[PDB]
From Swiss-Prot, chains A, E, I:
Coiled coil: none annotated. The central region FD is structurally similar to Helicobacter pylori flagellar cap protein FliD. Keywords: Capsid decoration protein, Capsid protein, Virion. This is Auxiliary capsid protein. It comes from Bacteroides phage crAss001. Its main location: virion.
Swiss-Prot record, chains C, F:
The lineage of its organism: Viruses, Duplodnaviria, Heunggongvirae, Uroviricota, Caudoviricetes. This is Major capsid protein. Capsid protein self-assembles to form an icosahedral capsid, with a T=9 symmetry, about 77 nm in diameter. Each asymmetric capsid nonamer is covered by 9 capsid auxiliary protein, 1 copy of the trimeric head fiber protein and 2 copies of the dimeric head fiber protein. It comes from the Viruses. It is found in: Virion. Displays an HK-97-like fold with an insertion domain that protrudes at the capsid surface. Interacts with the auxiliary capsid protein (via FD region). Interacts with the head fiber dimeric protein. Interacts with the head fiber trimeric protein. Interacts with the portal vertex auxiliary protein.
Curated annotation (Swiss-Prot), chain G:
It is found in: Virion. This is Major capsid protein. Capsid protein self-assembles to form an icosahedral capsid, with a T=9 symmetry, about 77 nm in diameter. Each asymmetric capsid nonamer is covered by 9 capsid auxiliary protein, 1 copy of the trimeric head fiber protein and 2 copies of the dimeric head fiber protein. Displays an HK-97-like fold with an insertion domain that protrudes at the capsid surface. Interacts with the auxiliary capsid protein (via FD region). Interacts with the head fiber dimeric protein. Interacts with the head fiber trimeric protein. Interacts with the portal vertex auxiliary protein. Transmembrane segments: none annotated. The chain holds residues 102 to 202 of 504 of the full protein. The lineage of its organism: Viruses, Duplodnaviria, Heunggongvirae, Uroviricota, Caudoviricetes.
Length: 333, 453, 50, 40, 333, 50, 101, 50, 333
């Protein structure tokens, strides 16, 4: 995915950390190499087509070197808690159409002027409770959002029961009220969704929304029937897809830019990251200043993406190696 | 070196974009045998009785479905044991297990030594009966390939303190103007800009030519360039004439022989050339022409059948003199060898091979090992150049000064638009270039091993 | 910012600032020119019309 | 997809262990705790 | 690669064997599905995108169904044992150029009229044993064949110390005389090489070769100095690179034929063959016949693949299932 | 068999007999035809420039 | 030494080579060398930092880095994007001789 | 630096910096005025402030 | 010699270290002066014409400071060991003229195009031992090289007897067969000569050479009768002539660029370096950066030399002082 650069960026996958230039057998393996004087730093990575060495980092031209976890890159999915405003009525009105309008921005197009609205309607009856109303609202919402004919997975509808306010239960176009037995439902959660991803073609994007309610006549007066309270996100979008689009881009600087342009006559680059893994990152920013007249700084950055296992191992070791090699004091994750 | 490069034509492109050409080749094939099986599928070993006795049936296994039904396929012993495809192929995943029948009157069978791995088969014909004939046969196709080349860029600079503007020289010892050859020439020039206006040009064209010819490729097999510029971007070097050619049709010897050479040159001429057009013009250094001479002699010296007489050879010729009325000279040199076919080995010694500056390895028999090196540069005749040096249209080189108050390169004496305050000037020059040899196999080269690795 | 078709492969892409030929190759603006006035015909003595 | 860069960005993957600005990025896998990155 | 079809060929990978349509979760799962009547047969496969099923096989219209082993599909690398014939001389003959010519028939082209000749030279000296000669010849062969400059791999030279007639001491252009400290070398093995392979553009080919010797004057008569005999191969090229191109071709029948053609406007097919594994195969040929005038047959091929652990455990259980399901009696290799 | 240059993908591919369309996509003689006259502009009321 | 494009140092008896230029040893392209910076001075010697070009991935034989080895100037290759300065030029001078009666 | 992609100049007689790049610079000085702010009444919703 | 400069270089000789500018009485006396904040560093030198102070070093702007010993600058004289190769013959072959050819590459001119060859001839006889051959050969080489009588042979020649394999035996055109008595001579050594040096106009150059042999006839082939293998040097031209030209050049940046041009109408410059002594060296590189819009750098070196006396006592004291004063930690060679 196209991004902004400070005149260049590079990426190298640390699939395994070795201790010598003689142990780079498998691809992805990497070692940090620095003088004992600690004047330069570079990385020997094992490429699928052999071995390589990253550009050399003059440790006195180092701007900032920071390690980033994976939790900080996992997009947190926006939730909206939806309920009945007890001000108008803590229960449904027995003849009013409770319509809900989810306005969407950044639908297919790129802009905010790309608006898109889906609805959910429930005409309420006499003996109706809040639980039954929330249930029917979720079904109406799913049949329009969680269906199998909509080109995009707009949202994810859920239901929560006061007995278990921690457990959320999904609702799809296939779900039926008989599957929803609990009589204590108090809200409707509406998350975002991980959209389709395509390496180098379709970057990881989202479509946010606002639940905008419509008015009901409660006592001869137009009044809104609900409130859309944001709650703490619960689901996330792992970074595997971000790191793979970063690698796909950063392997077009030290490599082929005609990735597929002219199909039989190409150079097939062998990317090394698994879009289904969670990586933890390390970005070292530094520059190159020349001699007497050439004082201008050519700023540079290189990224190292290792794998995470809950704990941030595979980078604390990488960090310790770079720290003992270059003397830099980088913080562990 | 400059003459060597001017022996090649130039191609003008439109931009600095990787380019490719189409490579179209040859068609006629023959299929290897993987296995042969008895009437019962039992594979035939090598030490076994013949098979197909009494026109009995058996199975042939191949790595491809290339033969059709009712066709007659022949092995290495063409037409002695003919096989008939009496049934479509039953594929074992990629191998086409045919069923066959001997169809040439064969009665004793076919030995188990002609039904072994490697046996090559071609296609004869699909014969059928006069009346009530049913369908047989099929047809077959092929497809070509392509190749690629890249470019590169070079840069030179030289900075000059501003006081060198109109800086006359005492000329106590005469001033010198280094030349391309290597020769110095006493020059009458008081201003010292005359002697930087020459070296930047000289050093820059030397950069070009040395890269054009002796450049290497920085790229990996994944496609990644491996040396990264100070800016951080990767450097994209191409490859020189020599590197592009020596990937194919290049031998490394520790000992030269007209035996070795003629075998190479004849085998090639047979596989590639007509009876005529086998005239090769080897290019070498003086030490090689000597090495050629001595070996042609070692060979002719083995022609113990004939007798060589100076009446026709004239290795001892009469010269006029005053020390005698019958005074003789004595000397000769072999320069050709017409081997038993239209193959003919002439020579062309070029000084580019004897230069001892470029060439640092020394042949123990004298000179530089690069003169003991034989290069055939144009095998056959191609409708278009196989070797051409590439240039871009309008985007070739850029000049520019980064100076302060005084520009000695121009004599400006006053700067409206200053670059800096340090009373100095820099000159910058950048140029792009590349070369292509379409076919590396259309050039032969016999090289000494000490020039290797 | 979603998939309209079923096989829609591209997505609306965006970058800020200084670009690179990589940026242009990532948005499909760099392609290798095919040298049409160049063609290697592999050489052999074709003994098939004999 | 395409990003914005400070004149270059180069990524190395540790699968098994005037100024012109440059950035080098190292990634590695997470196993729930942050090992293989505090190992970098 | 491209192959010849008997009007169609389908491929399906069998990574894991399940017992139900419900157990198909991972993209390589497979079930042989048939009815108690044993009248039809089909396979339920798990694709990167959902479940799929193969065309239905009429168990009365099966022409043949044979499982090939992985060993059968590995190309054996033909190797010679080069020596000096004791009839001319059992030891080198000083001052003679012991030249050796290696011919290559299917060089870059694919015809037998596209030949290529590489040479090896050794000039003999007094006191030269046979081991010393073979050493020097293997070295001169490597420098000309196994160099870092040749566009393609051509041969694998080896040496055999008669004290260990089994181990094939290798040789490369980097190897130097001193690295070979034995004195009982008795042959120069010359083995063909695995040529490079890329999925769907470079079929798995080989360049076959014959060693041609040259003459030497021994007692006044030009005589050949050596004898090249083929010996039972010992290195086989597995079928990973072969099944993979098979898939690449046979997946454009179920799916897209425009592979990568208009680079950004493409359907990216996900393949399940690992080109670093070893698969058995199970090909089944059958046909469809119509009703009362369309009696013409339409023979249609279907083949299945499964990794080999060395004992063919995966495919054996596979067909044991197919036999319990379809009544057939395919043989458990 | 084998390659001649350092970056070469294609090999000489051969087949026999019946030629389906999977063959024609395996020799790179199939491509999706770019529909030039068909092009969608996404519908929105552009409050920019206002 | 130059394993994995690691950098090393080529000490010399004078300062004759510039930054970014590629100098070639006795083998003249088998082992290309790229100058990583300007020459640091050790007395009158010029100590450079180098790294192998030419796709090298195995190094350069230590026998190819001993005293007396000869090095020439091949070219100064530079990146295509945002290219900072590299190179230099060089000079010479004559000699004279005498006689008497 | 040595060449201008903006104006198309390939040779630089007065180089600014040695790195081969080109940065544009544009600045404006602007102003706006209402003579009498009593002459405009507004009814702003309360959610748009604070 | 004409060295290269990164915008300037300067040298200051240090014959004594005095610790105070009041203690500077005789020439060469030096003291490193640095404030207590270690913001600037300079050197006060006792010039023969008084006192001078080095430019002031902004200690924030020091690039590299390394002290190099004298051994690191002593050119080692390339030796050789010429012998008969037992491969061909471990003894002289009677009737064959064992010509040896010395090949000189950098002869008067600078280039390798300027070659020069000096030969040596020895025709062998019956019973001629190896020692006797090496003897007559050394003599022929000497009488052909040293027979110039002007300055010096182009190479020095030595014999070595197996009794004392370390002790050399000089051989010059004055030497006689009778002078050489021992019979266990193994080899001929050919070392290169220290050519003449002249402060300012004849720098420390050399003439490199390789002994090229010429071919003789053994059993039936032309053959090189010997091998020229290099042995470890045993003589090093000392530094004195090298530092002296450094000063002669680095004292035209402080003093006059005219040295003798208008000969009588010129300045006498007093150079403080004894060209017949060994000197360690200490180069410091630093720059100056301006205030605003003047961030260009002006790099500049300051060299310091001190006589080596076995152990490097003079320079290690100077280093220790500069460290306690400037706060650097230059390493003591």
């Amino acid at each position: 995915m196209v991004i902004s650069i400070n005149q260049v960026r590079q990426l190298y996958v640390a699939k395994a950390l070795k201790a010598n230039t003689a142990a780079l057998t498998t691809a992805g393996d990497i070692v940090p190499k620095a003088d004992t004087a600690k004047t330069t730093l570079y990385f020997q990575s094992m490429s699928p087509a052999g071995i390589v060495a990253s550009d050399k980092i003059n440790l006195k031209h180092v701007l900032y070197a920071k390690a980033t976890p994976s939790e900080a890159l996992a997009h947190k999915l926006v939730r909206y808690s939806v309920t009945l405003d007890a001000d108008v009525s803590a229960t449904p009105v027995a003849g009013q159409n409770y319509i809900l309008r989810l306005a969407f921005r950044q639908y297919i197009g790129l802009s905010e002027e790309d608006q898109y609205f889906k609805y959910g309607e429930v005409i309420a009856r006499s003996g109706m409770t809040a639980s039954d109303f929330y249930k029917k609202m979720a079904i109406s919402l799913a049949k329009n959002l969680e269906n199998k004919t909509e080109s995009t997975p707009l949202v994810n509808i859920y239901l929560i029961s006061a007995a278990a306010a921690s457990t959320d239960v999904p609702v799809t176009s296939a779900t039926k009220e008989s599957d929803l037995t609990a009589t204590d439902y108090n809200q409707i959660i509406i998350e975002e969704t991980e959209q389709p991803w395509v390496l180098g073609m379709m970057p990881q994007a989202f479509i946010p929304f606002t639940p905008q309610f419509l008015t009901i006549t409660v006592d001869g007066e137009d009044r809104l029937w609900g409130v859309a309270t944001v709650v703490t996100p619960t689901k996330t979008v792992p970074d595997g897809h971000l790191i793979a689009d970063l690698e796909y881009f950063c392997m077009g600087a030290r490599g082929d830019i005609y990735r597929g342009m002219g199909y039989p006559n190409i150079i097939k680059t062998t990317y090394l990251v698994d879009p289904g893994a969670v990586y933890d990152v390390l970005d070292i920013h530094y520059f190159y200043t020349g001699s007497n007249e050439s004082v201008q700084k050519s700023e540079k950055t290189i990224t190292l993406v290792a794998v995470d296992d809950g704990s941030h191992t595979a980078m604390n070791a990488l960090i310790g190696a770079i720290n003992t090699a270059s003397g830099l004091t980088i913080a562990t994750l | 070196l400059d003459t060597f490069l001017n022996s090649f034509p130039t191609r003008e492109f439109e931009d600095d974009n990787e380019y490719y050409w189409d490579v179209i080749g040859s068609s006629r094939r023959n299929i290897p045998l993987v296995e042969a099986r008895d009437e019962n599928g039992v594979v035939v070993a090598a030490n076994a009785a013949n098979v197909g006795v009494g026109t009995s049936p058996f199975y042939l296994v191949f790595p491809e479905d290339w033969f059709a039904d009712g066709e007659v396929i022949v092995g290495n012993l063409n037409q002695v044991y003919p096989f008939r495809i009496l049934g479509d192929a039953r594929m074992e995943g990629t191998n086409a297990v045919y069923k066959v029948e001997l169809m040439g009157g064969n009665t004793q069978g076919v030995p188990a030594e002609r039904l072994q791995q490697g046996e090559r088969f071609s296609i004869e014909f699909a014969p059928v009966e006069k009346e009530l004939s049913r369908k047989v046969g099929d047809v077959r196709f092929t497809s070509p390939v392509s190749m690629r080349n890249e470019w590169t860029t070079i840069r030179i600079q030289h900075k000059v303190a501003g006081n060198k503007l109109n800086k006359k020289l005492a000329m106590g010892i005469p001033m010198v103007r280094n030349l391309e050859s290597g020769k110095q020439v006493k020059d009458t020039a008081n201003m010292w800009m005359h002697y930087v206006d020459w070296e930047v040009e000289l050093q820059f064209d030397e950069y070009k030519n040395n890269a054009m010819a002796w450049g290497t490729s920085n790229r990996n097999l994944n496609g990644e360039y491996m040396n990264f510029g100070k800016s951080g971007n990767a450097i994209k070097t191409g490859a020189g004439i020599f590197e592009q050619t020596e990937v194919a049709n290049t031998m490394y010897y520790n000992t030269f022989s007209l035996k070795l050479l003629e075998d190479a040159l004849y085998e090639l001429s047979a596989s590639k050339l007509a009876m005529d057009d086998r005239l090769f013009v080897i290019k070498t250094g003086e030490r090689g022409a000597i090495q050629f001479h001595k070996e042609v002699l070692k060979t002719v010296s083995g022609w113990t059948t004939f007798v060589l007489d100076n009446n026709s050879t004239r290795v001892v010729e009469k010269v006029q003199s005053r020390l005698h009325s019958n005074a003789l000279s004595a000397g000769f040199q072999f320069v050709e060898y017409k081997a038993p076919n239209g193959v003919r080995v002439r020579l062309d010694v070029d000084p580019f091979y004897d230069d001892p500056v470029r060439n640092k390895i020394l042949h123990p028999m004298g000179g530089v090992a690069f003169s003991y090196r034989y290069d055939i540069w144009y095998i056959g005749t191609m409708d278009q150049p196989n070797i051409f040096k590439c240039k871009i249209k309008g985007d070739n080189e850029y000049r520019g000064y980064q100076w302060g108050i005084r520009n000695p390169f121009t004599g400006q004496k006053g700067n409206p638009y200053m670059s800096f305050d340090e009373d100095s000037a820099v000159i910058h020059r950048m140029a792009t270039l590349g070369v292509c040899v379409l076919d590396p196999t259309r050039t032969m080269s016999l090289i000494p091993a000490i020039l290797q690795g | 910012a979603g998939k309209l078709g079923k096989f829609q492969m591209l997505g609306f892409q965006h970058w800020k600032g200084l670009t690179s030929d990589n940026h242009l190759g990532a948005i499909f603006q760099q392609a290798p020119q095919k040298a049409t006035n160049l063609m290697v015909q592999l050489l052999a003595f074709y003994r098939g019309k004999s």
